Design a protein around this ligand. Structure first.
Ligand SMILES: O=c1[nH]cnc2c1ncn2[C@@H]1O[C@H](COP(=O)(O)O)[C@@H](O)[C@H]1O
Ligand SMILES: O=c1[nH]cnc2c1ncn2[C@@H]1O[C@H](COP(=O)(O)O)[C@@H](O)[C@H]1O
Ligand SMILES: OC[C@H]1O[C@H](O)[C@H](O)[C@@H](O)[C@@H]1O
Ligand SMILES: OC[C@H]1O[C@H](O)[C@H](O)[C@@H](O)[C@@H]1O
Ligand SMILES: O=[P-]([O-])[O-]
Ligand SMILES: O=[P-]([O-])[O-]
Lengths: 830, 830
């Protein structure tokens, strides 16, 4: 059937009876009233059963051996569905497929019932998920720590072409994967005040909110390692949230508990944008405070909680603990770690600081100013009074280090300050993370250089040893074996299966680049994938597309820097050229654009309306026929990504050079047989460098060209004046050609494009359409297109998150990866 | 070990492996980190497994045979713990005891870990629970319908002698018994307006809240019948509660969902008191609306949803459906049933009314005015506009019936109106229930007569056939076999086990009233029970009591009509007599008073403080020694009741004649070996009548004496003037003898007692202490006391809820009870 594992005789029979056990005892249903949802749950519980045994020994193991622990703190974990992925990592896919078949059910139909775990916005959240999978696969004693939002990223609905947001009630039917652990509930404090008494400061009169943990298993690829993802939930104490007496109402007091519990209610839907709301800061301290207590408790047991030097010596803390900060969201971990060590454990400042710097590491994800976290001091002052004091003290001693290094450089002092003066005083969380971490990394080579050359230049001059790079990656399990079994099978037919955990081996595929059978096969799976997607489209969304056309897809969050608008300009150009010479041949294309816009991002929402507006005109023009369709992919999310990427021919990674930190969608497309048209931005540079620029469609300004243009001054009128095709398009938008009933509907877009384009869309227009003509030319030559595809696939090995994690481990965490199978799952009950 | 069933070889081995399965696969723990709480859950899941098989066939059975369905609507279901009770009804107690023992665990220690299901206030809620158990045991196709409050009756804490309320987070650790059924979620409407168009009225522009059901199994006693208790939970729709667009905030919209969900958040802690709050009315319509849709859906399938006359003829609705209204809380079921039939199904008013009257029956629980539900019309007008219209129309046609029956009687017309004029117009929910039900019953013979003679006199004259009586009862399973196995065993040693489901057989115990061995045994279990309670006291609450003394206990909600104050007066009298003649012998007594006060009931909270105040003085008087202790039983609830009742010698049922509808605690004491000192109130009359007044300690005014006194006019000064002992006590309270630091602390109690005692405490004082002297005299004669006890126990059979349910069934519901074992639980998978 494929190498989805063995469909053993004993195991298929075992699966079936367990499926029935659960349907009866766990779901309390009888075959006669069972719906597909019940069947999905019976299977999920059956599958979950296979990894609890491994989960328990894995954790018991780490307790016995006591290795260095890796704690990955992130406010986002974009997980997606977990049934198939669990089957894949346990080599259960074929057995379950067989078993459910014999039970008279379609496994694929049941998989579609599982709700996505959308506790993420985009790139950053998905990175955390891929990292978790790789850390388990590389056998590291790692823990994912975050917030269990009861409402994830909103579900996007398109009404009259506009995006409508609706609550993502993903827990509505239950989550069979998590395990509530109410017995490890921890208290978290807010507000209060600071008392300075005799031997130390005291955080007093605080409001207590409880953090209840939920553990979800994270299985490594076929190695019997099951790590843990602990997600905290907010709970109100039953005392003060009722006991602070003297009138108000007993009923109201109980109803008011949903005020402390709102902390974990919903995920903020902002991607690369900072919103200084109090609820957000509360979520940030909430995940940090609870997680650190858990980390320290585990450390206090280790082997020190037995003997060792005997004396809770935190000198070995850094040798047993490593906490990675996914962006500055968990930045409070730095002053909080200081607070505990100093205020509670009573260590001296300098010893505490040495420990904190040695255990914390920070990862930066963007260079745009509006994405930077700068928290108003008055907020920190009211909510976390002692942390503000600690931050001021950290700033004081840091700046003294600067003044000592650069005597007299008074401007450098203010530039580097963690405290920003002005309208309102703010705290620069990034400056905080650089100062309190022993490593700061970028997510792609060029982004990492930009950090040293620009944004964190002063910091780099002060401590060059801190700055590193760790190019992002994706997990080949979910992003290849899971979403594209057809491609994984033919690759395996030639080079084996070892590449699933050693992607570098894909290079061996280079020797089949002239193999007639392989070229036929690679091309066949892509055709099969496109047919399946074209079908899903009519099934669930309804209104036909042509599977013979080129599948041009751009899927990612809607942003001005991602330039979906530049894509739009090209689509309209193709339309206008067809209307000019109708009977002239052009390569057919289905251009699919999908992504979510933050609810408050007006421009982004205006762009989604433009996309749909173009499709209204283009898709109903009889002269155009089937040569060009514009489709907007609704509710783009992880599970939808697993469907479109394997069916894409052209991947669009066209952000303005210097704005996209790295990107990971680009890597997903490269590994699944799509050719890339993009700018020399983020990881695009490394991809092109790996596959060879000849097998890549690069266009537009390089970072240097952008800077030259800024020195000069960007004037969009110039481009409007010298390019008639561009001019024609702008006058089409301005006159209501795409919005008949509301002729001035797109005035904000035109106005912006001409007068405030921060991302110079026009400057790359000519080179973009010129470059698009070249891919059309190559698509007309099936054999050469496919041969270039093989060149990309065969060279994508470097972009596996296993390579990324192995580097973090060695160069930052100080631990050695291991592909050693844990001693089976075998029963055992001590 | 006892007749807690057989500890079979095969079944004890089976239990143990299943215990381990769950501990591993379900709780995901390993023996090395398992705590008693985990062990309790492993057992609970194991026990729950044994009744799912039965649960599924029971429901499948009712679907096949299609009998008349009994729907018990109540806003309260005072369930308590369910582990032991499930073991008892499945004959699993000894097997589980053995199994856990072999596993090295104490079952009793694990049972104490289960949290109580306190979805009730007192008498009314507990009645519903006992009824459920009996309906299952009598094999009726009955369904309990209510609200799944996430916070039940508050946990009571005593601080400095005052009651402190604290949220009852009973779901904190999970509920292994319930089964969420998100697939049967139903919509409920609120607000909106009424449109009158061409062919009918339309309830329009409403706010939708979703009702999600949760099913808990209700097992009959050893008959393999497992009925269902469906509890609704409020959920916000993900559309409008987000989709009603045009600014406000995306985050706020999601956070605001906890406004529709507040409907099922907490139970109102009022016992026999009406609070006209909007949240309450919303809970009331919420349980009613969701339940009726469920009832009709089930009816639409039956055998009509196949053929029959063919034409949804609701003429047979009353022949297949019976809905019992537990008080007027679910009274909206009447106008709601009308709304559906008329507005949706389009039946004519008169046919709809005939159907509604024929399927609804109402049970009244009290005669005090402040406990009556009179909802302000402006509330109904805004929240349920169409129901108000229906109610007005019901009133119109009802009153026309009255005028036709009593021509010219204009005052009778206003007295009987469902609409009350005055300050604000209100709707009398009780008048509504009488008019729309074919049966109205009281809960005790005297209470039922009082309803006909007083409160509902006019209604009785109009339709005498509607008024019935159904004396309350308690379930002998939880209230005998579960809480007092020692007593159940010795009874069984003599007359067998058949009495557990046929309490009448306890009469055979009369022939052992002179049996020397039995008297020794009855007395022995009571001594064993008192010793165990005296121990629990020091274990969990700490500060000694004497097990040789008389256990004088009064446990029930704190009320002015229950007269805990009269008890207090007696306690202080005993104290003063001892201080007068210290070296004189008196029978030692431990008087225990327990119960909860509604948070807003100031007087009730003042009484709890008085009780504790008396204990502060009495319990520390060296001259008193061990002859008198005053203890306040903290957090009285179901599980605590199972502990005190079996250990009580004297039961206090001293409410003012005519105020206690029935009472059930009195029956629990009688069946467990306690003698009763009380007034001729509620069921006390029937109990005394059954055991013989010679074996009962009756005192005080009878209903007639109370009325005579009211004609005359109650003047407490008179009693204060002629009784020196009483006078001494009042001057003790007035001068701060019981409150040194705050001498005027109890001024409200004294003031009330002397000037506004609605329950004439003083009028019964003399006869109460006189009567108390008589029980002390009899307690001095162990053999005669025990012989009287045997006379009570042997005569308590009539107070089983099995007798009560059999009468409801035959005389109201029109169904025949059956003690037929359902065809085993045996596997099966169709
Ligand atoms: O005190 C202990 N004794 C024995 N095993 C322990 C102890 N603490 C942790 N463990 C084991 O380590 C796993 C890790 O627990 P955690 O990391 O503290 O959540 C547990 O599930 C146990 O198998
Ligand atoms: O349409 C039906 N076909 C077969 N069995 C049914 C059907 N509806 C109800 N049942 C059975 O009756 C039980 C009662 O369902 P309910 O009373 O509607 O909640 C179900 O769990 C099934 O065993
Ligand atoms: O680092 C993970 C991702 O974080 C953010 O979403 C960046 O915009 C993206 O470029 C990067 O790939
Ligand atoms: O009917 C059940 C119970 O309802 C109420 O709690 C009444 O006060 C009580 O007398 C009665 O026994
Ligand atoms: O993270 P990028 O692929 O939008
Ligand atoms: O219901 P009663 O025993 O307080």
């Amino acid at each position: 059937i494929s190498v989805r594992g063995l469909a053993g005789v004993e195991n298929v029979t075992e699966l079936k009876k367990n499926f029935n056990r659960h349907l009866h005892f766990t779901l309390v249903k009888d075959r006669n009233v069972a719906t597909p949802r019940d069947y999905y749950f019976a299977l999920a519980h059956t599958v979950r059963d296979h990894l609890v045994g491994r989960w328990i020994r894995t954790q018991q193991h780490y307790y016995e051996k006591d290795p260095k622990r890796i704690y990955y703190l992130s406010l986002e974990f974009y997980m997606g569905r977990t049934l198939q992925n669990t089957m894949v990592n346990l080599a259960l896919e074929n057995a379950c497929d067989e078993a459910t078949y014999q039970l008279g059910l379609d496994m694929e139909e049941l998989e579609e019932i599982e709700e996505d775990a959308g506790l993420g916005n985009g790139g950053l959240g998905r990175l955390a998920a891929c990292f978790l999978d790789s850390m388990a696969t590389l056998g590291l004693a790692a823990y994912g720590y975050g917030i269990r939002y009861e409402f994830g990223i909103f579900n996007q609905k398109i009404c009259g072409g506009w995006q409508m947001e609706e609550a993502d009630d993903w827990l509505r039917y239950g989550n069979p994967w998590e395990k509530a652990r109410p017995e490890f509930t921890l208290p978290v404090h807010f507000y209060g005040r600071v008392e300075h008494t005799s031997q130390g400061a005291k955080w007093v009169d605080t409001q207590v909110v409880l953090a209840m943990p939920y553990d979800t298993p994270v299985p490594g690829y076929r190695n019997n390692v099951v790590n843990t993802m602990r997600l905290w939930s907010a709970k109100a104490p039953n005392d003060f949230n009722l006991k602070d007496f003297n009138v108000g109402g007993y009923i109201q007091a109980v109803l008011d508990r949903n005020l402390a519990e709102n902390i974990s209610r919903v995920l903020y839907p902002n991607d690369n944008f900072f919103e200084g709301k109090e609820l957000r800061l509360k979520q940030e301290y909430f995940v940090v405070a609870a997680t650190l207590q858990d980390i320290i408790r585990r450390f206090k047991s280790s082997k020190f909680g037995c003997r060792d030097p005997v004396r809770t010596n935190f000198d070995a803390f850094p040798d047993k603990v490593a906490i990675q900060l996914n962006d500055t969201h968990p930045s409070l971990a730095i002053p909080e770690l200081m607070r505990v060590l100093v205020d509670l454990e009573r260590l001296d400042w300098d010893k505490a600081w040495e420990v904190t710097v040695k255990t914390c590491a920070y990862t930066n994800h963007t260079v745009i100013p509006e994405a930077l976290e700068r928290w108003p001091v008055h907020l920190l002052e009211t909510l976390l009074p002692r942390h503000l004091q600690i931050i001021y003290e950290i700033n004081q001693r840091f700046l003294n280090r600067v003044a000592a290094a650069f005597p007299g450089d008074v401007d450098r002092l203010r530039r580097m300050s963690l405290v920003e003066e002005g309208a309102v005083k703010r705290i620069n969380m990034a400056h905080l993370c650089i100062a309190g971490s022993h490593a700061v990394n970028g997510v792609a080579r060029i982004h990492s250089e930009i950090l040293k050359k620009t944004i964190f230049k002063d910091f780099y001059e002060l401590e060059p040893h801190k700055f590193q790079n760790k190019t992002n990656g994706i997990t080949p399990r979910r992003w290849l074996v899971l979403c594209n079994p057809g491609l994984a099978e033919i690759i395996a037919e030639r080079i084996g299966e070892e590449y699933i955990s050693d992607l570098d081996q894909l290079r061996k595929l280079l020797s089949y680049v002239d193999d007639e059978a392989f070229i036929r096969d690679v091309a066949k799976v892509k055709q099969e994938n496109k047919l399946k997607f074209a079908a899903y489209l009519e099934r669930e969304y309804k209104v036909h597309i042509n599977p013979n056309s080129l599948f041009d897809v751009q899927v990612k969050r809607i942003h001005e820097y991602k330039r979906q608008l530049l894509n739009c300009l090209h689509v309209i150009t193709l339309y206008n050229r067809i209307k000019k010479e109708p009977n002239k041949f052009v390569v057919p294309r289905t251009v699919m654009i999908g992504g979510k816009a933050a609810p408050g991002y007006h421009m982004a929402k205006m762009i989604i309306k433009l996309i749909t507006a173009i499709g209204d005109v283009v898709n109903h023009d009889p002269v155009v026929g089937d040569r060009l369709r514009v489709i907007f992919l609704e509710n783009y999310r992880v599970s939808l990504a697993e469907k479109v990427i394997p069916a894409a021919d052209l991947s669009e990674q066209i952000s303005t050079a210097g704005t996209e930190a790295s990107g990971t969608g680009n890597m997903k497309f490269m590994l699944n047989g799509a050719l890339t048209i993009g700018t020399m931005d983020g990881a695009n540079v490394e991809m092109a460098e790996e596959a060879g620029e000849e097998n890549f469609f690069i266009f537009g300004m390089r970072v240097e060209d952008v800077d030259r243009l800024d020195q000069r001054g960007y004037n969009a009128q110039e481009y409007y004046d010298r390019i008639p095709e561009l001019r024609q398009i702008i006058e089409q938008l301005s006159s209501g050609f795409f919005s008949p009933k509301q002729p001035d509907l797109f005035k904000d877009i035109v106005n912006m494009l001409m007068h405030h384009d921060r991302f110079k869309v026009f400057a790359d227009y000519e080179e973009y359409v010129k470059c698009q003509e070249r891919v059309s030319a190559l698509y007309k030559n099936p054999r050469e297109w496919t041969r270039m595809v093989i060149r990309n696939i065969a060279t994508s090995g470097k972009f596996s998150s296993d390579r990324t994690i192995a580097q973090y481990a060695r160069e930052i965490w100080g631990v050695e990866p291991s592909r050693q199978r844990l001693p089976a799952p075998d029963e055992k009950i001590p």
